[PDB]
Design a protein around this nucleic acid. Sequence first.
DNA 1: CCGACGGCGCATCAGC
DNA 2: GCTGATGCGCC
DNA 3: GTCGG
Length: 326
Amino acid sequence: TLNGGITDMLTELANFEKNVSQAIHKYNAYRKAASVIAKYPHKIKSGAEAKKLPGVGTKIAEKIDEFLATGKLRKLEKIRQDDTSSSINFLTRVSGIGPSAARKFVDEGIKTLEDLRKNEDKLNHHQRIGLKYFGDFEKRIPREEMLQMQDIVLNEVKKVDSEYIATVCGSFRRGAESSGDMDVLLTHPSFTSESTKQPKLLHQVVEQLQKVHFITDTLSKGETKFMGVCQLPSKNDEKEYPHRRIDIRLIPKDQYYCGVLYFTGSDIFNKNMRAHALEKGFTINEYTIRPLGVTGVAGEPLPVDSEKDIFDYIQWKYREPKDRSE
DNA sequence: CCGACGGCGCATCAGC
DNA sequence: GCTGATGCGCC
DNA sequence: GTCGG
Ligand SMILES: [Cl-]
Ligand SMILES: [Cl-]
Ligand SMILES: [Mg+2]
Ligand SMILES: [Mg+2]
Ligand code: NA
Ligand code: NA
């Protein structure tokens, strides 16, 4: 991590803009810059050197010069001292509490973990579970544990219907040694872009994982996306494992490649790739890649038989999952 | 200079 | 009840 | 905040 001090600064600025300022484009700008700097293979010597990178402009260059010179950023020193900003930044660390809710809570005098813990009745379902597992959700998952979780999910899904295919995506599929959570892409031949021949496809699977005490809580649930909590079983006399976040996304089987591209990420990689697509005259989502017609309206879905096909359309050399950790 | 910035699932709520 | 906006979440 | 037209 050659430029860890700089990327940390930019990430903190991004979080400020997202959580406090509520300026989503500034948030995205800062994260793009941190990402491009993170992959830069030299220790950065000045703002000008950084400004050569795409996504780093005049203002970030200036902040880099201050940070190189002094080891800190005055702007951030002040933000750190601001009680309201500090409170809002903290509250948003609870899953289900965003920029808006955090500011509203602070207005009501709810601004610490203790405050939250005595005001559960002021939380919606999602927020109440986020609070319940506040500490657990901040811990990362060792790949060894991700492997254990993979085995449970794949084996239980098979028990439900041998025709399901479950694929673990996210940072796991990018080969990370630790993951923030578990992301599972699910397919079944009864659910395609052309028909849904079986109901409760996602439900059946969730139910089974709850039955074996793997899924412990639900944050939200619809026909195609589950967002919840899970936990590895522990042995006799063993401390319990932390509770972990799990997302399950059922994708039309014939749209698996666009699905797995999306769910493999990273998020910044997806943003960069989708933006490049738009520049090349295509639009990409988790289902399809379509051309943009002269007007500006998406056209019909193009044939895709591999992840690589998607890269080809937009004239990118193929990038293995492990090289998409932007 | 200024329009655009990725795309979409689920929960909540206002207006009808 | 529905629909459209908004908040918050996924990558 | 940065980029491209
Ligand atoms: Cl700092
Ligand atoms: Cl589509
Ligand atoms: Mg993940
Ligand atoms: Mg996730
Ligand atoms: Na630049
Ligand atoms: Na949050």
